[PDB]
Structure 1
Amino acid sequence: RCLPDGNLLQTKIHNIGATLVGVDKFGNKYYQKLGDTQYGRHRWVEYASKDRYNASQVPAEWHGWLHFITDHTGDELLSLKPKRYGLEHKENFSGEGDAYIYHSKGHTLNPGQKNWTRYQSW
């Protein structure tokens, strides 16, 4: 706890009756409080980064279960993530310095700024 400075207190006021369904690699604890009441508020995630958290830290294995699109906890879709090309999440580093943010291939901030001139000069 010790955060009376966030809405994280609203999540920690949840979890009082909720059951913990799995926890992904990053530490985000995925909770479920069904049966009681208030559909739409019976699946959430405790981000395990009580500060500096934001959305999109929820990996794709769980981002289904947590938006109610599926009923497969990330401990069940982890047997379906492709091993050959599977890639870990990236938290959406939007703005947090260059080389973390994404860059196109001509942005002059991207190492290896490609030239698009279709004609090959002499």
Structure 2
Amino acid sequence: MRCLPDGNLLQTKIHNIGATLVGVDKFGNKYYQKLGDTQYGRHRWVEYASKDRYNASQVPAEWHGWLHFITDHTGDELLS
């Protein structure tokens, strides 16, 4: 129901359709990828655990590099 007032979250729900779950972090944020080519193959995004009051600073360090295409290592591989 958050989709109706929050259009930003709606776009993520739409683009999650057909996506692959890559992992979940300690805060419950979920990480998805597509493996296509629309934004030059950049298809990584995060669904924040809190559907309201989400904030970019909630991405932990182990997943920050993966989210920003700095590294191809997921948060799980970095933690191991």
TM-score normalised by length of structure 1: 0.58
Runs of 5+ consecutive residues of structure 1 not aligned to the other structure: 79-122
Flag the structure with more relative contact order, 1 or 2, with Cα contacts below 8 A and sequence separation at least 6: 2
TM-score normalised by length of structure 2: 0.86
Structure that is richer in helix per residue? 2
Deviation at 1:17, TM superposition (A): 1.4
1:54 alignment counterpart: 55
Structure 1 vs Structure 2 CA RMSD: 1.7
CA distance in 2, matches of 1:62, 1:40: 19
Which has the larger Rg? 1
CA distance in 2, matches of 1:73, 1:33: 14
Deviation at 1:18, TM superposition (A): 1.1
Q: Identity over the aligned pairs, expressed in percent?
A: 100
Runs of 4+ in 1 over 4 A off after TM superposition: none
2:13 aligns to what SS in structure 1?
A: helix
Structure that is richer in strand per residue? 2
Deviation at 1:9, TM superposition (A): 0.5
- Structure 1 residues 55 and 40 mapped into 2: Cα distance closer, same or farther (>3 Å)? farther
Deviation at 1:4, TM superposition (A): 3.7
Runs of 5+ consecutive residues of structure 2 not aligned to the other structure: none
Aligned length: 78
Query: 1:36-82 CA distances to partner (integer Å, 9 max, x unpaired)?
Result: 5323640010001010111110000000000000000001001xxxx
